[PDB]
RNA sequence: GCCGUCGCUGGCAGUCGGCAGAGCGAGAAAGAGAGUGGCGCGGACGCUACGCCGCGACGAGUAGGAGGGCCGCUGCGGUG
RNA sequence: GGGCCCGGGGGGCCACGCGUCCCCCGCGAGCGCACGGGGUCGGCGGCGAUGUCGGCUACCCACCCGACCCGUCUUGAAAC
């Protein structure tokens, strides 16, 4: 066996390579790369030994069964889908949340998680929005950007980090802010907050909520 | 012959039920109660029947012998199986495949046996 | 359709008497449900009494 | 012994693949050839005109051999002679389309149905898009989309038309078997013109839509294909 | 709307025997299979004449 | 917690209103049972806009969900325990309806047996 | 997309299983031919053939014709 | 311009074994991605036992658009 080699045909456009068949034929040196033509486990027992079937026939059969589906292609699971991000959402961009209890608040975009959801912070001390996931379709990307290129976001802050844990009821069960989250909030905030205060009137801008008022029309105004 | 006897009874039989846009057959040795040439339990030389035992324990597998085709009293051989669920199905599968006795009724016989045994569990 | 086996004669006690009769040929005749229904249909009208106002 | 039969089974599959692979090369190279041919036809017309303009003369190009015909009127109140001619063109429905190779016999049929059709000369792009998006074959008298090349080859193969490119070349250049390749195609079902019409009830030269609009049919084909 | 007539769409021809005879229909089952699964046009002709009516099946004399 | 069918496809009805007969709102003598209007001037027969509609084979239901109950099953009237057992091998597609004229005594046995065979009953709680 | 009609007078008896070997939709007649010399015991559904399945086109209607009604009413032979 | 874009002295080719005779001068293997014979997620969230959830249709009400009374003779009927 040999180590995999990166494709020698760069992509020109999706589905079309840069090089033709004969061009690739030479690049791959195919002129010299020519080539020519358990179900049971035995166990001892206290007979002497028994041949044991690893998988047993069903003990039941429903009266009816559905047939097998026809085969398709291109229907991937969610985890294998490509994630897209609006070009207007770069790290350090200020976004306006449009849904949930934090609607109208202006928050700082940190990064896009593997699931495709965005990660944002208020920061908490400015508008009481913590490290929280938000969906890009439900945010307005303003044109205001702070430079958070030097901010080290903890690497454990992943989709699994922010996934909700189920709470059971038989009265009521209350969510609790784990001490780890508080520690993570301070670590990230301590780096973003000084950079927000570098821009005049920006911390006050982040404290203030977005709302439409008389005569103000979203299609007319720049964000 | 079976085919000739199916032309007589396919739409004229005391065992024929037509109702609610559905058709069934109530004769013995019909594994699916289906008005069908394949599943009819009277017109073929060889037939398979699965019924519950006289007591609600086990199944009775009925096989039609080859010889007495015109002698209804000795025509059918009954066998009671009262093993565990998986062992009962294996015997039915072997009684059909190994003997090559209507191999086209193998899963219908196995599905009917699983439905009788399941009905013999305690009702929740 | 040319098989005429022997048919057992049974005794009044429900056992084979040992005597046999060859199956009469009439039991191998064509079975025609449509001829029977035609004949049963038209013969069953022959015992009717007339009615009229 | 089964192993000997399996090799026979495999060697039959290999041969079919090797024949299938050689056929792909044939259609690949026919298209490469047609591309060159179309370019020479396009360039040759320009060169003939340029050399006539140089000498102070006029180069008069050959009258078109191909017309595309669209029925622009409904089916209510059609006179018997128009009704028969529209049936022979296979335009039995409004906005149906067909290619019609031009000659004295056919040009005079198109004159009888002048109020009921918009026609004109399609360019190479019109023949491409018409047959790719909306091309259906008449196979065993059924309307089958030409989704695979074998569909063309089984019916027109005897005329050496074995791929969509061979079909487009027979139609566009009006080849020896235009009649067969063109009857093979089901009449094109075109949509309502997007962007509207001018006046379907009068001639194109009157500011309407009926009649011969020459190369201007291509604009109409873009909006209906 | 499509300009076409519909008076001739339905073809008048027997797809089966009008007879309810069960022996004739067993022969039709037989020759339906043979006509379908063999390339023999003779089977198709016989299958067609099994559907035919009494007057379309004249008796053939010995002479 | 009721027995479920093998599949539960969405049931699509082209029309859910009934086809009420023409002029049956105007008289009591005209019942709402559909009658095809056949008068010469009848504007319903001519399909004038805004008038009572007429049934036609276009309203036909999808063959896959036709005669299907909202639960996903198809009913089958039964009069006794013996008729019930025909549904033993199709208990995942066909349910049981007990006929109206079966006495309260016998309904207990039919309902009792149906539970054992995993057959669903549409009207098990009647005549208690 | 769904319903029906018509057409293909289309396809399916091959459910040919451990007495096994799964194919015959494919551009272009005719054989997945036969030979003679040089561990496991397993493999969904189907087929009321008056059944089931596929593909394409089509659908106005008085007078009038024809088909199908597991439409409805009363009584008779059978059967349940 | 046409002649597999004839013959001689930086960029793409659906050229790429060979012994030759010479015109001319019949089965490699694997692995993987996919604009590939019609949709999937191997993606998630909220709410729920006395006032709430679902209920096409049906009972009543409202609104917007549509809307003349049937049968009949009749070229023509909502017809004064
Ligand atoms: Mg007009
Ligand atoms: Mg527009
Ligand atoms: Mg006019
Ligand atoms: Mg139409
Ligand atoms: Mg008509
Ligand atoms: Mg007619
Ligand atoms: Mg009138
Ligand atoms: Mg009609
Ligand atoms: Mg109004
Ligand atoms: Mg009158
Ligand atoms: Mg008058
Ligand atoms: Mg009137
Ligand atoms: Mg008046």
Curated annotation (Swiss-Prot), chain A:
InterPro entries attached to this UniProt entry: 60S_ribosomal_eL6 (IPR000915), Rib_uL2_dom2 (IPR014722), Ribosomal_eL6_CS (IPR049633), Ribosomal_eL6_KOW (IPR041997), Ribosomal_uL6_N (IPR005568), Translation_prot_SH3-like_sf (IPR008991)
Lineage per the UniProt record: Eukaryota, Metazoa, Chordata, Craniata, Vertebrata
GO cellular component, one term: rough endoplasmic reticulum
One of the protein's GO biological processes: ribosomal large subunit assembly
Annotated localization: Cytoplasm, Cytosol; Cytoplasm; Rough endoplasmic reticulum
Pfam families xrefs: Ribosomal_L6e (PF01159), Ribosomal_L6e_N (PF03868)
Molecular function GO labels: RNA binding; structural constituent of ribosome
Family: Belongs to the eukaryotic ribosomal protein eL6 family.
Annotated protein name in UniProt: Large ribosomal subunit protein eL6
Gene from which this protein is expressed: RPL6
Complex and partners: Component of the large ribosomal subunit. May bind IPO9 with low affinity.
Residue numbers carrying Phosphoserine: 72
Function: Component of the large ribosomal subunit. The ribosome is a large ribonucleoprotein complex responsible for the synthesis of proteins in the cell.
UniProtKB/Swiss-Prot annotation, chain B:
Keyword Transcription: no
Record's subcellular location: Cytoplasm
Source species, domain of life: Eukaryota
Protein name per the record: Large ribosomal subunit protein eL28
Cross-link (Glycyl lysine isopeptide (Lys-Gly) (interchain with G-Cter in SUMO2)): 57, 64
One of the GO BP terms on file: translation
Family in the record: Belongs to the eukaryotic ribosomal protein eL28 family.
Keywords: Acetylation, Cytoplasm, Isopeptide bond, Phosphoprotein, Ribonucleoprotein, Ribosomal protein, Ubl conjugation
Gene giving rise to this polypeptide: RPL28
InterPro entries attached to this UniProt entry: Ribosomal_eL28, Ribosomal_eL28/Mak16
GO molecular function: structural constituent of ribosome
Modified residue annotations for N-acetylserine: 1
Quaternary assembly: Component of the large ribosomal subunit.
PANTHER family registered for this protein in UniProt: 60S RIBOSOMAL PROTEIN L28
Modification type Phosphoserine: residues: 114
Major location category of this protein: cytoplasm
A single Gene Ontology CC term: ribonucleoprotein complex
Function of the protein: Component of the large ribosomal subunit. The ribosome is a large ribonucleoprotein complex responsible for the synthesis of proteins in the cell.
Curated annotation (Swiss-Prot), chain F:
UniProt key word 4Fe-4S: no
Protein name: Large ribosomal subunit protein eL32
Modified residues (Phosphoserine): 61
Species for this entry: Oryctolagus cuniculus
Cross-link (Glycyl lysine isopeptide (Lys-Gly) (interchain with G-Cter in SUMO2)): 8
GO cellular component terms, A-Z: cytosolic large ribosomal subunit
Domain of life: Eukaryota
Short name of one Pfam family: Ribosomal_L32e
Record family assignment: Belongs to the eukaryotic ribosomal protein eL32 family.
Assigned keywords, A-Z: Cytoplasm, Isopeptide bond, Phosphoprotein, Ribonucleoprotein, Ribosomal protein, Ubl conjugation
């Amino acid at each position: 066996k040999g180590k995999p080699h990166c494709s020698r045909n760069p992509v020109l456009v999706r589905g079309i390579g840069r090089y033709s068949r004969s061009a690739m034929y030479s690049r791959k040196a195919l002129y010299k790369r020519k080539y020519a033509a358990l179900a049971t486990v035995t166990k001892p027992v206290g007979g002497g030994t028994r041949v044991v079937k690893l998988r047993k026939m069903p003990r039941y059969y429903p009266t009816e069964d559905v047939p097998r589906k026809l085969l398709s292609h291109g229907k991937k699971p969610f985890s294998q889908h490509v994630r897209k991000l609006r070009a207007s959402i770069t790290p350090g961009t200020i976004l306006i949340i449009l849904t949930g209890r934090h609607r109208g608040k202006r928050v700082v975009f940190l990064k896009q998680l593997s699931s495709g959801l965005l990660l944002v912070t208020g920061p908490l001390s400015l508008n009481r929005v913590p490290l929280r996931r938000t969906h890009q379709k439900f945010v307005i990307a303003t044109s205001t950007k702070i430079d958070i290129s030097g901010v080290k976001i903890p690497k454990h802050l992943t989709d699994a980090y922010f996934k909700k844990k189920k709470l059971r009821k038989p009265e009521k069960e209350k969510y609790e802010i784990t001490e780890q989250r508080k520690v993570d909030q301070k670590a990230v905030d301590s780096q973003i907050l000084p950079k927000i205060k570098a821009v005049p009137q920006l911390q006050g801008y982040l404290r203030s909520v977005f709302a439409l008022t008389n005569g103000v029309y979203p299609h007319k105004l720049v964000f | 012959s079976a085919h000739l006897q199916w032309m007589v009874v396919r739409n004229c039989s005391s065992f024929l039920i037509k109702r609610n846009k559905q058709t069934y057959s109530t004769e013995p040795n019909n594994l699916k109660a289906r008005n069908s040439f394949r599943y009819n339990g009277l017109i073929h030389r060889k037939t398979v029947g699965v019924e519950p035992a006289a007591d609600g324990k086990g199944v009775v597998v009925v096989m039609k012998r080859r010889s007495g085709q015109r002698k209804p009293a000795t025509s059918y051989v009954r066998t009671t199986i009262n093993k565990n669920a998986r062992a009962t199905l294996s015997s039915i599968r072997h009684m059909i495949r190994k003997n090559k006795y209507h191999p086209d009724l193998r899963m219908a016989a196995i599905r009917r046996a699983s439905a009788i045994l399941r009905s013999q569990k305690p009702v929740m | 359709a040319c098989a005429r086996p022997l048919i057992s004669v049974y005794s009044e006690k429900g056992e084979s008497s040992g005597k046999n009769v060859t199956l009469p040929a009439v039991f191998k005749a064509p079975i025609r449900p449509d001829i029977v229904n035609f004949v049963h249909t038209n013969l069953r009208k022959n015992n009717r009494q007339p009615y009229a106002v | 012994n089964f192993a000997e039969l399996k090799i026979k089974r495999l060697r039959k599959k290999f041969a079919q693949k090797m024949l299938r692979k050689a056929r792909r090369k044939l259609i690949y190279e026919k298209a490469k050839h047609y591309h060159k041919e179309y370019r020479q036809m396009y360039r040759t017309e320009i060169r003939m005109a340029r050399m006539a303009r140089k000498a102070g003369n006029f180069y008069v190009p050959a009258e078109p051999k191909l017309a595309f015909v669209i029925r622009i009127r409904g089916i209510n109140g059609v006179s018997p002679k128009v009704r028969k001619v529209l049936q022979l063109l296979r335009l039995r429905q409004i906005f149906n389309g067909t290619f019609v190779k031009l000659n004295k016999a056919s040009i005079n049929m198109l004159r009888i149905v002048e109020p009921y059709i918009a026609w004109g000369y399609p360019n190479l792009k019109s023949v491409n898009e018409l047959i790719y998006k909306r091309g259906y074959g008449k196979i065993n008298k059924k309307r089958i989309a030409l989704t695979d090349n074998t569909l063309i080859a089984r019916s027109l193969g005897k005329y050496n038309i074995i791929c969509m490119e061979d079909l487009i070349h027979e139609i566009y250049t009006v080849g020896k078997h235009f009649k067969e390749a063109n009857n093979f195609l089901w009449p094109f079902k075109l949509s309502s013109p997007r962007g509207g019409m001018k006046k379907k009830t009068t001639h194109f030269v009157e500011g309407g839509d009926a009649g011969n609009r020459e190369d201007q049919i291509n604009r109409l084909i873009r909006r209906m294909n | 709307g499509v300009d076409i007539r519909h008076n001739k769409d339905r073809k008048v021809r027997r797809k089966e025997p009008k007879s309810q005879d069960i022996y004739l229909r067993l022969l039709v089952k037989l020759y339906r299979f043979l006509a379908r699964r063999t390339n023999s046009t003779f089977n198709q002709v016989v299958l067609k004449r099994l559907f035919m009516s009494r007057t379309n099946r004249p008796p053939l004399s010995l002479s | 917690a009721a027995l479920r069918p093998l599949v539960k496809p969405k049931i699509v009805k082209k029309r859910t209103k009934k086809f009420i007969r023409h002029q049956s709102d105007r008289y009591v003598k005209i019942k709402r049972n559909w009658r095809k209007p056949r008068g010469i001037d009848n504007r319903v027969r001519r399909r004038f806009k805004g008038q009572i509609l007429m049934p036609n084979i276009g309203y036909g239901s999808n063959k896959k969900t036709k005669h299907m109950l909202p639960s996903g099953f198809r009913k089958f009237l039964v009069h006794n325990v013996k008729e019930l057992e025909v549904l033993l091998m199709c208990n995942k597609s066909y349910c049981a309806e007990i006929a109206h004229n079966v006495s309260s005594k016998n309904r207990k046995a039919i309902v009792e047996r149906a539970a054992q065979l995993a057959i669903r009953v549409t009207n098990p709680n009647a005549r208690l």
